[PDB]
Amino acid sequence: HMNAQARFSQNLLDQGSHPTSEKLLSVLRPASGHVADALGITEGENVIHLRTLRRVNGVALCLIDHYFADLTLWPTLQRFDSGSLHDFLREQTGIALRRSQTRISARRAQAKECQRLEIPNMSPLLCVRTLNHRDGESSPAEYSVSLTRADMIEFTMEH
Amino acid sequence: HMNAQARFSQNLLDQGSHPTSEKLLSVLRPASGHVADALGITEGENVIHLRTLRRVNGVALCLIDHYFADLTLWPTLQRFDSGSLHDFLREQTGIALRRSQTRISARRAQAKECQRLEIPNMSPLLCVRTLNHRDGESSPAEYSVSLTRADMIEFTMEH
């Protein structure tokens, strides 16, 4: 057994659709070049953007930006409030998202990140970026960018 | 497809060390409390410790400490020089280690971490800690702790 070196342990596969998560924003907005590339779409074309935040005992720990290319999902995703985003989508539409690719990196918090995660400038973040496809195939339905306070959470994975 | 946030990408599920990794040390040594817990052995009993490092043009990128419980691997492991340590072990003994658990954290380098990875105080590191098993058994075979400069490497995983 490996002991935990951070206060909280989070399963990597569960982290993007956590059940204590709260929606902070749900808007239609033009796709940045980086969002457009992940989704396989055109820069500046509208995407659904939801931002969610989870706290533990008040303390913001994980902020996630979720981008979907399928605007048919808008009347559904705008009604998400709190809880597991993917569970919400699945009950509403029967669409079950599964992960295709994950990227994990660490960087110093800059700018709007410090503000939204409520942390001092340059505090380390773990950044987990995932492409999810419908239980089906290989056109990503969701690109999510999660930023977690590295001083509070360690990710775990069982194989 | 996702852009890369770092100069180099390493597969999170790749076992052992990079094909250009060099051995820094192979020794028998008493297990520390963390190492003994991971390997499910008594603190203080000997383990084989190998340390490897990947550099690019002299710049240290990825340091891994690998700790094996089976001392009978010593004739093999003391002979490792460079390359993929898991490929070397497999070529020499037939043992192909498989992962049971992974923990990923991030932290700011200090003291001996800054010395070994040749980086400034507080430089962000990704720390990846894994337990690996010979096909089947309760006893893990190997506990490894990777420390990688987060300004130079991002991890990827295909699902």
Ligand SMILES: OC[C@@]1(O)OC[C@@H](O)[C@@H](O)[C@@H]1O
């Ligand atoms: O970042 C906000 C804060 O409340 O988070 C928990 C602790 O790290 C406190 O130092 C810190 O001010």
